[PDB]
Amino acid sequence: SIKIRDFGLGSDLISLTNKAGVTISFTNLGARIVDWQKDGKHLILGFDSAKEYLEKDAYPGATVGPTAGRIKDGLVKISGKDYILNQNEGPQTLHGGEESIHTKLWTYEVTDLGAEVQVKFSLVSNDGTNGYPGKIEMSVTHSFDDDNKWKIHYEAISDKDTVFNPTGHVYFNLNGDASESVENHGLRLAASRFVPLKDQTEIVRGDIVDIKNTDLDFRQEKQLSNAFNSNMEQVQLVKGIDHPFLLDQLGLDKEQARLTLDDTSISVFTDQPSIVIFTANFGDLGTLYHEKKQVHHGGITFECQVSPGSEQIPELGDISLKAGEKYQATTIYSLHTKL
Amino acid sequence: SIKIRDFGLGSDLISLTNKAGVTISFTNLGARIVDWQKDGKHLILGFDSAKEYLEKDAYPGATVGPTAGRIKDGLVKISGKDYILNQNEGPQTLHGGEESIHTKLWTYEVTDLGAEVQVKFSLVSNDGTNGYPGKIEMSVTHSFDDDNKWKIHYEAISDKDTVFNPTGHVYFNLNGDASESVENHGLRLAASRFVPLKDQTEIVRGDIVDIKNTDLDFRQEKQLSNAFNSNMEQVQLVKGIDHPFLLDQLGLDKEQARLTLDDTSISVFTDQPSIVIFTANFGDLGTLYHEKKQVHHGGITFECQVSPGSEQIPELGDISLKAGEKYQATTIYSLHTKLEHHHHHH
Ligand SMILES: O[C@@H]1[C@@H](O)[C@@H](O)OC[C@H]1O
Ligand SMILES: O[C@@H]1[C@@H](O)[C@@H](O)OC[C@H]1O
Ligand code: NI
Numbered sequence: 001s002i003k004i005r006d007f008g009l010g011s012d013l014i015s016l017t018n019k020a021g022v023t024i025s026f027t028n029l030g031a032r033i034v035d036w037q038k039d040g041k042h043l044i045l046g047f048d049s050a051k052e053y054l055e056k057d058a059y060p061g062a063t064v065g066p067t068a069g070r071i072k073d074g075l076v077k078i079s080g081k082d083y084i085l086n087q088n089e090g091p092q093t094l095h096g097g098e099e100s101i102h103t104k105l106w107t108y109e110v111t112d113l114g115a116e117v118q119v120k121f122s123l124v125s126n127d128g129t130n131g132y133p134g135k136i137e138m139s140v141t142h143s144f145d146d147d148n149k150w151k152i153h154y155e156a157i158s159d160k161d162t163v164f165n166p167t168g169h170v171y172f173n174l175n176g177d178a179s180e181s182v183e184n185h186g187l188r189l190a191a192s193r194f195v196p197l198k199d200q201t202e203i204v205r206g207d208i209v210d211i212k213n214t215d216l217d218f219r220q221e222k223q224l225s226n227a228f229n230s231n232m233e234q235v236q237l238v239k240g241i242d243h244p245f246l247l248d249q250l251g252l253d254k255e256q257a258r259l260t261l262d263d264t265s266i267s268v269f270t271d272q273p274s275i276v277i278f279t280a281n282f283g284d285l286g287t288l289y290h291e292k293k294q295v296h297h298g299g300i301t302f303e304c305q306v307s308p309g310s311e312q313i314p315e316l317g318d319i320s321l322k323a324g325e326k327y328q329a330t331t332i333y334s335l336h337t338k339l
Numbered sequence: 340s341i342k343i344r345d346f347g348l349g350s351d352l353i354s355l356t357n358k359a360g361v362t363i364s365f366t367n368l369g370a371r372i373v374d375w376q377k378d379g380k381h382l383i384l385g386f387d388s389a390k391e392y393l394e395k396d397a398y399p400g401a402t403v404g405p406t407a408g409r410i411k412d413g414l415v416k417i418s419g420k421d422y423i424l425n426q427n428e429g430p431q432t433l434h435g436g437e438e439s440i441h442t443k444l445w446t447y448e449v450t451d452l453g454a455e456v457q458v459k460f461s462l463v464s465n466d467g468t469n470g471y472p473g474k475i476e477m478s479v480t481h482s483f484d485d486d487n488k489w490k491i492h493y494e495a496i497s498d499k500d501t502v503f504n505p506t507g508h509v510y511f512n513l514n515g516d517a518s519e520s521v522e523n524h525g526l527r528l529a530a531s532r533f534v535p536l537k538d539q540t541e542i543v544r545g546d547i548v549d550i551k552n553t554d555l556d557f558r559q560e561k562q563l564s565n566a567f568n569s570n571m572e573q574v575q576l577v578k579g580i581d582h583p584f585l586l587d588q589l590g591l592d593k594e595q596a597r598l599t600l601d602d603t604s605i606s607v608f609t610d611q612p613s614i615v616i617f618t619a620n621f622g623d624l625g626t627l628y629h630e631k632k633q634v635h636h637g638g639i640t641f642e643c644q645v646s647p648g649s650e651q652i653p654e655l656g657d658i659s660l661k662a663g664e665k666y667q668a669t670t671i672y673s674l675h676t677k678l679e680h681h682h683h684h685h
Contacts, residue, residue: 010351010444010460011446028349028444098474105445106444107349107444109348126438126439127425128468128471129468130466130467131466131467135438
């Protein structure tokens with residue numbers, strides 16, 4: 001079934017319940033996921049109204065872009081030309097600059113396919129917005145099916161050569177409560193390398209590092225507490241994880257990562273080359289989620305995209321989008337319950 | 340009473356009814372008015388859903404900007420610097436450029452003051468959008484009260500020196516049917532001069548002309564057909580009216596214009612220096628409004644703002660907005676019944 005309701009500030013809340021009684025909900029404010037629940041328990045972090053997101057934290061669950069991550073000095077080169085983007089974190093451009101696409105009300109259309117329901121969000125980024133060449137016509141289709149598969153499909157077309165590499169910022173917390181650390185979840189990640197950060201500014205350091213056999217090797221399922229208790233300088237730098245991981249094998253068919261807690265597990269599939277993991281290293285912030293004060297490590301992201309830092313490390317990939325080319329991306333979050 | 344419902348594509352429809360039973364409706368898509376009715380009759384032009392606006396014509400009843408009108412070559416000078424803006428009409432920048440503010444979903448909050456209800460819509464124009472320096476935090480408050488006054492209050496603050504001069508693009512049609520021309524309406528307008536257009540491109544000629552005692556002189560009420568039937572060069576150029584008129588006396592207190600049909604009148608008040616008037620010179624386009632094929636001259640706007648062309652005619656004003664300065668503008672459309680005797684035929 002489908003239910004639409006006023007989410008505040010002129011935004012809508014779109015809730016989908018599949019045949020298995022699983023409920024997932026989204027909002028047009030930032031083409032974002034707000035909740036995902038099973039048997040009354042929330043699997044992800046989210047607020048109860050549009051206002052909360054604009055006052056507390058606008059990233060959770062949102063479509064971020066046009067470029068996800070930090071861009072050193074807000075500098076990108078396009079067709080040999082240097083372009084300066086909006087700088088919203090010191091000199092860096094973080095998640096597309098200030099008042100980016102996650103803060104806008106997107107238009108949308110719901111398509112009921114029976115076993116599957118689709119919500120297609122659209123937004124036009126004008127040419128010059130936050131320094132990005134355009135216009136860029138973008139759409140993010142969030143879908144949910146009777147197999148408990150939540151899929152995200154991106155599409156974009158630009159009138160001019162530009163850059164584009166968005167992502168989904170959902171934070172998972174199988175504890176169903178923000179006051180509870182995810183240190184108890186087990187994680188499996190099919191990546192043998194990672195991208196270290198230069199320092200507290202969080203820009204990339206410049207190199208690619210092999211993590212095989214270190215506290216960050218999750219090639220074999222392990223509890224996050226390990227990583228959390230690690231003394232690797234990289235973990236110590238950010239007090240948790242806040243880094244890009246390079247997937248070993250590319251393709252939408254492989255389970256790239258898996259987050260597990262008890263009988264409940266979430267598998268991640270993507271056509272993207274990397275997964276950026278952030279473990280809500282907020283310390284004492286205490287953001288309130290559903291009346292619960294969030295704890296340091298009270299959530300984990302799986303941002304699928306091209307790794308940030310390509311500006312300095314070309315081997316990472318190329319985020320350019322040529323005029324007239326159609327950009328496409330697909331990321332899947334699959335829910336599973338042990339019998 | 341206040342009522343809300345989905346209006347299409349994710350937008351909302353905000354419907355207000357005052358103590359006199361007069362209803363008015365707005366949409367967050369473009370901080371726009373959709374309808375205004377008296378006793379079941381549409382006073383303005385509008386559609387029945389958001390999609391229609393996007394597919395037929397996105398201007399009607401919309402908030403337009405950041406700069407309303409045409410800027411020759413998209414060129415503006417800002418604090419000694421030349422800036423080129425998005426060019427969406429040949430080399431011209433028309434109504435802020437492509438996919439501008441009128442096409443966005445603005446966030447909004449309603450405030451019930453009893454005798455007055457305010458609908459404040461908000462939107463941020465990011466720095467560099469369509470070429471405009473910013474970022475610009477804008478808000479448009481549409482309010483309707485027990486005295487049948489529909490007021491539009493604009494507010495804006497920029498992080499950077501930029502340009503700002505928006506307007507409201509409502510179209511009136513007292514016939515309550517798009518298929519009927521407004522030539523049967525009577526118009527009073529307190530303006531002695533106008534701004535001629537260079538040509539078909541519609542950029543300003545460069546001069547300001549006195550129109551006293553011509554077919555465009557409406558200081559004393561006259562039927563609109565007098566203008567429509569005119570063969571003055573400017574009228575023939577655009578097949579109707581499509582020009583800025585300079586107010587003679589400035590101030591929000593003065594009734595600058597009055598549109599009448601039988602027992603109904605719309606009065607226009609504003610704190611702006613001009614009124615840009617467009618009489619839907621669409622010819623045979625026939626856009627459908629509530630299943631009625633719109634006719635040539637099937638509507639009329641009263642776009643209060645600083646006159647377009649200031650780039651070429653500095654006398655018109657200055658639309659610059661200094662960083663940190665708070666911009667404000669207020670326009671009021673008031674409904675009256677039996678204000679005067681208007682009984683004519685065509
Ligand atoms: O990596 C980012 C982190 O450092 C913080 O800024 O929140 C958003 C994350 O995606
Ligand atoms: O003046 C404008 C007219 O010439 C046309 O472009 O439609 C919109 C009006 O605002
Ligand atoms: Ni709504």
